[PDB]
């Protein structure tokens, strides 16, 4: 979904969300505002110390987007999916029934 390969740097991803926020600029807060929020919060996860480290240490090779029963959600849910195998697989897509 992000158009990036497993060998992508967090910097690119950070850059992507910035563009995403500009691109998915809702200007309709009550309707498309939740979509923005997901990028903002997902971005915030990316900008999270632990998440950056974990990706940097040994996550990159898994960042291929499995899709097949991997916990598919929204484009921003990617991190929620990757960190969802620890008792969070029962959760829902971000922006589903909010």
From Swiss-Prot:
Signal sequence range: none
TM spans (from-to): none
Organ and tissue specificity: Ubiquitous. Isoform 2 is highly expressed in testis and lung, but detected at low levels in thymus, prostate, colon and liver.
Locations listed in the record: Membrane; Cytoplasm; Microsome; Nucleus
Keywords: Acetylation, Chaperone, Cytoplasm, Endoplasmic reticulum, Lipoprotein, Membrane, Metal-binding, Methylation, Microsome, Mitochondrion, Nucleus, Phosphoprotein, Prenylation, Repeat, Zinc, Zinc-finger
Residue ranges constituting the J domain according to the UniProt record: 1-59
Highest taxon, organism lineage: Eukaryota
Name of this chain's protein: DnaJ homolog subfamily A member 1
Organism name: Homo sapiens (Human)
Lineage summary: Eukaryota, Metazoa, Chordata, Craniata, Vertebrata
Gene responsible for this protein: DNAJA1
Full protein stretch here: 10 to 107 of 397
């Amino acid at each position: 979904v992000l158009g990036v390969k497993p060998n992508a740097t967090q910097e690119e991803l950070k850059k992507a969300y910035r563009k995403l926020a500009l691109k998915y600029h809702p200007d309709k807060n009550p309707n498309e505002g939740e979509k923005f929020k997901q990028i903002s919060q997902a971005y915030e996860v990316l900008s999270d110390a632990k998440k950056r480290e974990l990706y940097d240490k040994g996550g990159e090779q898994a960042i291929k987007e499995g899709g097949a029963g991997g916990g598919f959600g929204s484009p921003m849910d990617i991190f929620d999916m990757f960190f969802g195998g620890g008792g969070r697989m029962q959760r829902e897509r971000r922006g589903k029934n909010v």
